[PDB]
Design a protein around this nucleic acid. Sequence first.
RNA 1: CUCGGAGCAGAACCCAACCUCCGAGCAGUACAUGCUAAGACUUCACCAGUCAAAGCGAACCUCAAUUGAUCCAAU
Lengths: 77, 80, 49, 74, 143, 53, 354, 95, 19
Amino acid sequence: QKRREREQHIAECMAKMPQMIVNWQQQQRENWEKAQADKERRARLQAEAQELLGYQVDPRSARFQELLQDLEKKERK
Amino acid sequence: HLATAEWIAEPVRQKIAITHKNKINRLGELILTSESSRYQFRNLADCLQKIRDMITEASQKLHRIRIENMNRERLRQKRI
Amino acid sequence: RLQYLIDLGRVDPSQPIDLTQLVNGRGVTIQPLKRDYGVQLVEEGADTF
Amino acid sequence: WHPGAHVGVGKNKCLYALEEGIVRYTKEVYVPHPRNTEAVDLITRLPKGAVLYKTFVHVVPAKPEGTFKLVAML
Amino acid sequence: PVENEAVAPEFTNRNPRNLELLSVARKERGWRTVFPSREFWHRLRVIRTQHHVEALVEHQNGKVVVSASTREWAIKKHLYSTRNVVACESIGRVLAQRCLEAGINFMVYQPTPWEAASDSMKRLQSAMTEGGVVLREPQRIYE
Amino acid sequence: SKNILVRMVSEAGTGFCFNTKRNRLREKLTLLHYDPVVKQRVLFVEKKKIRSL
Amino acid sequence: RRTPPLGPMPNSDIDLSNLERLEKYRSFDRYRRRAEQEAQAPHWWRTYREYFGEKTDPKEKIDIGLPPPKVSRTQQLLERKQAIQELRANVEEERAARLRTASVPLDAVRAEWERTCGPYHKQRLAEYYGLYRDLFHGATFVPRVPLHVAYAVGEDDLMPVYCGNEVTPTEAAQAPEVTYEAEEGSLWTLLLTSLDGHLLEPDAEYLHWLLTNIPGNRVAEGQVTCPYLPPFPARGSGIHRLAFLLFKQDQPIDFSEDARPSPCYQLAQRTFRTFDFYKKHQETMTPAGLSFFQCRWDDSVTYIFHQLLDMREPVFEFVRPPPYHPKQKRFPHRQPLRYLDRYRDSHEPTYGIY
Amino acid sequence: LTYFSARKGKRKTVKAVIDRFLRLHCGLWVRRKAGYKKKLWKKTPARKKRLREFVFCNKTQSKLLDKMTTSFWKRRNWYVDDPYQKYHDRTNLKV
Amino acid sequence: YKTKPTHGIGKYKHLIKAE
RNA sequence: CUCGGAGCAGAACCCAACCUCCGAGCAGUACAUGCUAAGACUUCACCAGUCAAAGCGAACCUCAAUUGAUCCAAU
Ligand SMILES: [Mg+2]
Ligand SMILES: [Mg+2]
């Protein structure tokens, strides 16, 4: 009984494995897409001068603008 | 001898003949040897097991070889 | 060794052989307090038997 | 030193022979792989007409692979 | 007792090519630090000059097996450019059919990164493959 | 306390497991690995933590 | 201690007083060029070449053979210049080359090559495969005369025969067709020889297809002293390289020592030495043509073993030497338990006296 | 080590080596390599295999063990379905 | 090796610029 | 108070000093960082530590030390 039940369990599991493997592939692909979505934003920051502490000052304005735009869109939905 | 064995049927007979021409003697008798063990009784046993597996399957680098064969066969195209 | 002993003539093949007759012929040692539950046969000697 | 003529290399830069025979040392020319950027830049900055050598080990195969012998005369 | 039945125990073939065609010979494995890998039996070497294009299929001993050349009149009589992608592809086809002629079914080629990225070498390799030669050496047998 | 050693398991019920290092900041990881009994590449999920390093 | 350098050390031609004005290796390619050139060049110190490279004698290989014809180099280069001129003057080749859509007649290229520059590459292949080192013990020649041979398979198709081509025994079971397009007003001779076919001793060959006193390209009129018999490449022997030799018989010669009866399929009859054969018979003539191929074992080879040759078939095999293991010691240290298996003969168990 | 007992006046074996080692009748001793059970995560495959593998020991160690142990653990032993019946005996040794 | 005439065959630093 | 590298120790190996210097007790990338196996080195013994052919099964690791035995405990 033990042998049969464990064998059928592993069998059904390995039969199911391909679907979750495709799910894992698309998971990696969407993670890479989010990496794209954030690095496209981090690429350019300022085009005026090369400040030291100012680097992470002005971007927050546009970032919060986009955040509130998304929030208003979701509230509208 | 192969063809004299009445206890074997003709399909298995000619099948073994054509599949294992390497081991057949000039006089037509198939021969097989075994010295893997020290026990000649066990040697006879595994020999008869081999020939039984042969009966069953008859009743039922290769890459490189076929590659060079296909090369020869693409080259050989010529007209008289 | 069994062939050796039956040729020597200590064991009587005309009668049923068993470990009693073997040890009476001194063919094998046994040490029951050493938890040797008996005797097995060995593949060696299949020929000339 | 550097390998050559049936001489492998371990991860810790240990030299070992691949086949059975006689060891010997010689000098030969050294050409890196294009990924070895250090030696690549070295041979580029090098002045024309001059070439560098390096030591190399070679094991000489004493015996052949095997021999053709009769198995059965039938 | 038959004069034709007389056979020696060992059979001595003086063919250096027997073992390498049987896959049993030893390749010059090693030189892992150096770029040209000696782990071959039949290496191809392409020379791309500013006047012609040459190709040498040669044995590991440094000696030539077969050669193709743009300097050959037999080859260039039909040929416009001596160095273009067309010239490289034609030399590829010629050397491929020459290998089929000389029985060379397998061989090796060590291209550099840019030499591989060049479409000329790519189309040359495609031409040879369609001619019927593979640029891969079988794995040695022993054990 | 940068990294963490975590175990992952055969989801088939084979009981085959092993351990790897991970950054505790990062999310749960699920990776392919050669399960000898199942004798092919199969995803394992990492379940729990054992000790920091 | 120190010792002076024997020969001129490398990179000594250069000067260090001027370094910036000197141009450097702009390219891995140029460095490779110079490197392999100097590698082909010799050196006084010990090198890989004088251990793993051919130890051929320094003297050039003797070859009293067909010299090249006297071609007018001036007129030849002039006609070649005219050819390339009209070629560049053609109009479609521009688009063909710049669109990568052109090809070339393989048959025409092959014929022109085997006419002009073939023989040198044929010499190359010959002294590669080792035909000359085995036949003439070093001496060489040039097969100026082309040579075509075919094994007609059935009625429609045929297997060609050229330098380095596979030949199946089922196809080589019969005599082939031959052409060498040479009138010459004189005679010719042809012989098919197997080098590694003989088994009892080395440097010994067999002869399968012999024709002598061939008046012109016609072949059937050429008499035969050694009748036809296919080779017998045995199973496990590997491969056998068989060569077509062709000589330019200036005048008919005798064959007493060579006169052979009906085949008799006698290896002692077929066996001889091409070296002394050429030395004694071929002082009047010289080599003119050359080809070869390779053969392997087959079912037809088995048939001719059992029936034609009238002898049992041999069965060889490649066998490697035993794997080395050192001498044992009574007390190994830090070795796994299979240390004993590395030396035990029988994997089976054994009991001493019980 | 305990060359004589107080109750019988005989030698006495240390059960430590019994727990640790295994003796072959031909005079050999074997042991499981130390450090095979801890710190597997940082170790490499080669190291893990070298540690899992069995080993023999020196003649010095073997005879130290033999001196501390008694003859009963040196006797010949015929087990059932134990693979070491092949190795209790020695084969192809000279000098 | 130093004693032997082949000493200094591999050195290149005097060829390249030093910095 | 251990480990690694350089000089002292110039040229196969070894060489101390409360001798002279610079460092470490990690980190990063994969998840075949899987299993087995010929032959060999070894921090002057041991403990340990090391390289690895071929094969099955697969594709088509860097760094210098970067670390810890037995018993016992947890599972
Ligand atoms: Mg030591
Ligand atoms: Mg391997």
